[PDB]
Enzyme design. Structure first.
Site: not given
Ligand SMILES: C[C@H]1C(=O)[C@@H](O)[C@H](O)C[C@]1(O)C(=O)O
Ligand SMILES: C[C@H]1C(=O)[C@@H](O)[C@H](O)C[C@]1(O)C(=O)O
Ligand SMILES: C[C@H]1C(=O)[C@@H](O)[C@H](O)C[C@]1(O)C(=O)O
Ligand SMILES: C[C@H]1C(=O)[C@@H](O)[C@H](O)C[C@]1(O)C(=O)O
Ligand SMILES: C[C@H]1C(=O)[C@@H](O)[C@H](O)C[C@]1(O)C(=O)O
Ligand SMILES: C[C@H]1C(=O)[C@@H](O)[C@H](O)C[C@]1(O)C(=O)O
Ligand SMILES: C[C@H]1C(=O)[C@@H](O)[C@H](O)C[C@]1(O)C(=O)O
Ligand SMILES: C[C@H]1C(=O)[C@@H](O)[C@H](O)C[C@]1(O)C(=O)O
Ligand SMILES: C[C@H]1C(=O)[C@@H](O)[C@H](O)C[C@]1(O)C(=O)O
Ligand SMILES: C[C@H]1C(=O)[C@@H](O)[C@H](O)C[C@]1(O)C(=O)O
Ligand SMILES: C[C@H]1C(=O)[C@@H](O)[C@H](O)C[C@]1(O)C(=O)O
Ligand SMILES: C[C@H]1C(=O)[C@@H](O)[C@H](O)C[C@]1(O)C(=O)O
Lengths: 140, 140, 140, 140, 140, 140, 140, 140, 140, 140, 140, 140
Positions: K22, K79, K86, K99
């Site tokens: 990093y 990830h 959302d 990243h």
């Molecule tokens: C900040 C970095 C992470 O915290 C990792 O978990 C991610 O897989 C990669 C990342 O977001 C980065 O390369 O900036």
């Molecule tokens: C509130 C909605 C979400 O925030 C979505 O992430 C979810 O896949 C569906 C949901 O829970 C909804 O349809 O009420």
């Protein structure tokens, strides 16, 4: 005392149909063989066959209601039907699944059954004698 | 005329070992049952058991050389051993795979066998009577 | 009062064998360490090692019969043997699975065990002290 | 100067066993061929065969201790044994994996080996001459 | 000399919460047990618990900065949080992952951890004594 | 009497290119080595290299038409090209697949080949001597 | 104003059939409950049940033609039938999928439906009251 | 001289049903088109349609018995029915699978058929003219 | 008599946020609707919303302690949080999972929930009326 | 009025190459057949073949620019090339994918195409007449 | 005119934390760099960082409400979090995912993001300059 | 001082080709833009494009030999070519992968690259400005 033998789709066609996989014995002969073996064993065998899922389901229900054992060769529905599985799940008497062919020596999708897990046990690859063996088990 | 019954790992322990899954019949009783059924059937049954893969392999070779049929319950090796599969593949006489338990009603890894595809056929979930049924098939 | 410590394949080779993964302590030293810790704890430790599955199985049976606890490091069989799993499943006394190495920091296939699910618990990556910790648990 | 040739399960049966897949050369002939080729090459070949995993493991250990190269055809254990893999991993001298058959032209499970990754290299499908080629490599 | 014990989500609820899976010991009792064992061992135990990921992350950072060892039971975040993994990855001192329950005997998704690979080692299924064993390791 | 050695993409770059994986021998040296070994063996070696799939395909066709054997190291196309596979499938003479590197000790995608199944056999991880061994096989 | 309630395979058997999973209310009672709730709501409920896929398909077509809403519990066909899915896809009026049981707390294959994606919405695990709730939605 | 055209579930609904995917031609029109094309081609076309699997199976049997060719659009059963597959497998005359829609441009589950492998060939995405093309093939 | 309605991340944003998927009703309106329906039903509804997992967990604990039923729409945590699942698992009173959107008609990852299996039941795709239906169930 | 027929890798070899899978008709004959059928149909057929991806891509571009329809049999690139897919995606006129062989009756990797989804439709397993049928479609 | 730069979990720790992955630039330096680049570009950069999901969500909401663009490095939540996805989905202004590390050169689970699909675009592996490049894009 | 910009298959077609996914800027314009930006940055940009893999490979080799940095948009080969990957792996200077489109918002197969892991970094979804940003990085 009474056993239901239940045969699914394309088991009427048994006889003429791919004999290298399934044999030259016809369905009527099979009924004849079973009915005879049952006599020797003191049982009565009721053998039925249908290509209709709903018909099979009805026969299964009836056996569930009668608390009668079932020997079931469901043909292709073995690999596909949850509905069938759910009917058989109501059976209190034993359930023996039978396949004429060794499904494990064929297409990979035949190596799974929805019925096996709720069966008492399963015979495959012993040809039509699998039926007769299944009878004899139930006799004990 | 001669059948080999071959039992794999933990089948000695049969009797005492988890009876809800496998029963109260012991291995010696099982030999006794088989040996008797064979007499009735005009066969001679040679029943052997080992927890050793190499020992099982040797017994299989011998049957291959003798062109004698085999009934095989390989226990856990059913799901794991290619080596076993490869020995059984040399058999000219029939091979019947037997499981006492309905493996299809248990852990998902038990629902696969390396042996089933090269078996003539397979009996599962009929308890120790599966052995006896397997005999009778071979009798025909 | 008595604990069985059971070591599988390639654990004799412990000492000389890849020390960056497994350490410089030899198997005899390990027996010595365990035997001493047991004395301190009021237990007797019976430590055995074999590269033979059938031998391990026999030792497990014996512990099942004796209702004695087991500490088991099965080596590579951990990832491969159902047979072993099935023997351990007969144990009434506790079963602690031990790995010297952190398997979860290595090849992806090492991250699965057939034994873990039927173990009471599992220690990994704490080196040979994992054995000693496993002892102490059983002491309570 | 010294090479170990190590043959796993069902390689004794080589000769009689499915010749369309594995050939008509027997194991003793194979030893004879190898021993001769070694003479021509100025090496000494020590060829051993066992259907016992623990025996194979011991032979591997010995080669690790001797820092001697190994040619290994593990048969079915190639696809199943981590234990074997772990023993071979201790070898400092080269390791050549040999299969007589082209495993890549057969069942899908044969297309994976636990040994290949820790092998120096791998020969398959060249029949028993694969052994001889493996020798010659080591000669350089 | 100082160890951080870090407990994740729903570990406060320990005591009242599903005792057949996790036991009747409460979190405060657990702190009491740990604090006592530490005294016996010459360590000081700092035990903390939070249902907040950001709070756990802060505690981990602090230990990274202090180069202090950590015992971590992250609860459900074990199976879900990369963020946590990444914090723990900064630790120079040892990290022992602890689960009270044998996760390998439960739902299939519990059999994976993001933490295990960067842990020094992992204890599971030994109940709250897993904490105490983890202490003792660090004591050496 | 005549063998075609066919080298795919990036095999010109052999020599300069990542020598820890592939070595310091250059492509011209490789041709020289092969051509010499062939002389010793009474064969004529025709070695060709292209980074062009269509060019490789043409060379394969020509060998199919001539019923001449082929040694093929297709580089990365081994893992990707069905087209290549389909050309090689037309070969009546033997086909030996060669990789310099032990692909099984590298990225997981390298552990699959479209060519292996239609190859006679396959050599990997023996460096550029794999070519020479492949020659000698064909010599018999 | 009119709602079709459509019940698939084994829903006639509702009542007698595994009451711990599905309850003691029979199908006729269910019709009675629904018909009453509809009256309270100013709707007319047309409830039908068949173990025949073709019959269900016909009822669906009819509703498509009538632009009438449907409440559908297809039983096992939920997990298996594309045909059903394709019929329901023709519906202009809303479609509510209902399961009596919480399928998500059962076998893993029950956790997928072909119907859910083309449903307006889905109710599961609320028993036979799921039907009644589904009605009330449509009432708005 | 005679061809059977066999249409599965929801093909009656063709016409009214989602015309952007399947078109505005109705089933009767389709019969009319086919019957006319057959006349031009010197064939007789027997076109049948059913939403019932057992009915389709019967029609297939009949064609097997008559050794007559079949054009089959099985609708959703294409993706689900082994039973159907097994009936078609008995056909000695050619079997052409037809889909009106390009299934490969739709849901991922439509991209698999149980029928395709035992079909002579398959036409998809050419609308109702796929039927007519299928006829003409059989004409040669 | 008392029901907890618990709303997870981004449910405050309900109203303004993608109305084609979730509607034009705001969170406060939703509280108002629920609170009114509860009055009609003789219940008291306690509706809470947080984008904080730890806050949701606390509310769940409280309901577990109070043995009060919960209606839970956890938003995105439905698909990701084991921690949440584990809290809900402590609930003795019923748990109804609610989604406004038909998750089964959207991205494939939304078709899995960690909560569904430990829910009593689940309503999806019925918009904000799903809450109201969930109330009414609990009323019985 | 003008159709492009485009043939990929190894289609020149058509004729001599595995006739049990692909037939005895050569590529020139195929051009002759197509050119004749086109005359009968009032079209002009431009048939081209290359084992070079870049050449195929150029021909596709040209057809995109000309808004001319394409019949494409891409050979092995069907299963491998995204690049090809992306070129075809630019076509405004129809695209018919043709395979001579029934790919669905062969290796499992042949059962996927990158082209099918962006094709108008697809013909397979009808031999070289598939080309001619594809023409006739375009004629309407 | 205004850009939000939003940094997730463990980005405070940037500087001290694994510099080989990093870098040695700290978070405050990063703010300083960004703030300066923004001045040069005529923008105002609002850079924020939190290890709290709910805090990140709030910042995202605010940007959605303000219709302001966002640069987002969510750390490990990239990830794991649907919730985050959302929130970002509500953004009308552009979203650039950044990243520092090349995630595609690391653990396999890092090669998936829930955010990438709803991002405008994504920069990875360009270190902290990725932020600055992301700025400049938005400047156009 | 010198940068190679390398564009793969169908990037010539850029301009006319699906502008909603890729834009209205043509390839020549793109060269013009890049060449100008380079001047501003004190670099010289060598931009090349080919639909031929072998041509791309040659350009990569040349850059490897020259130790010059590369910006590479390989088009569809990104997802398919190992060969390309292997060439790029020889580069000592930095490698920036560029995609015009946000591949993560499209077909699932586009979400994998063979190049990303050996890239220094990767820009996607920023249109043709991604090239320009990639330049500027290299400038530092
Ligand atoms: C900040 C970095 C992470 O915290 C990792 O978990 C991610 O897989 C990669 C990342 O977001 C980065 O390369 O900036
Ligand atoms: C509130 C909605 C979400 O925030 C979505 O992430 C979810 O896949 C569906 C949901 O829970 C909804 O349809 O009420
Ligand atoms: C009757 C047979 C079939 O119809 C097949 O579908 C099935 O896979 C095997 C079968 O049940 C049999 O071997 O009896
Ligand atoms: C003897 C049994 C076993 O040992 C189990 O490993 C196997 O899965 C099933 C078994 O073969 C049996 O049911 O007889
Ligand atoms: C003894 C070790 C082995 O033999 C490995 O096969 C196994 O994966 C891990 C092991 O059990 C150990 O870490 O103790
Ligand atoms: C000796 C052969 C076997 O025993 C098979 O199990 C293995 O898959 C291939 C084998 O190792 C061989 O081809 O030499
Ligand atoms: C505390 C426990 C949990 O919260 C579970 O989510 C986890 O799977 C196992 C657990 O970490 C434990 O067994 O201590
Ligand atoms: C020449 C090498 C390659 O180009 C790699 O792509 C391939 O995976 C292995 C290779 O074929 C080799 O080891 O000779
Ligand atoms: C009626 C039930 C069934 O028949 C099961 O096959 C299905 O998985 C669940 C069911 O639809 C139900 O819970 O109502
Ligand atoms: C008739 C159509 C269907 O019913 C669909 O289920 C199937 O996926 C495609 C179909 O067979 C068709 O495109 O003709
Ligand atoms: C021409 C044929 C091939 O080259 C194969 O690679 C492909 O799988 C099928 C093929 O496209 C064909 O059947 O025409
Ligand atoms: C140039 C584009 C392509 O050709 C696509 O195959 C690829 O998936 C994405 C692409 O590389 C791009 O977005 O620039």
């Amino acid at each position: 005392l009474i056993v239901n033998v239940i045969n699914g789709p394309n088991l009427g066609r048994l006889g003429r149909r791919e004999p290298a996989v399934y044999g030259g014995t016809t369905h009527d002969e099979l009924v004849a063989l079973i009915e005879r073996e049952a006599a020797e064993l003191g049982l009565k065998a009721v053998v039925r066959q249908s290509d209709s899922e709903a018909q099979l389901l009805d026969w299964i229900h009836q056996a569930a209601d009668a608390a009668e054992p079932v020997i079931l060769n469901a043909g292709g529905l073995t690999h596909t039907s949850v509905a069938l599985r759910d009917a058989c799940a109501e059976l209190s008497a034993p359930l023996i699944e039978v396949h004429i062919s060794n499904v494990h020596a064929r297409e990979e999708f035949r190596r799974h059954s929805y019925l096996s897990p709720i069966a008492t046990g399963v015979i495959v690859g012993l040809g039509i004698q699998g039926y007769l063996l299944a009878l004899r088990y139930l006799a004990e």
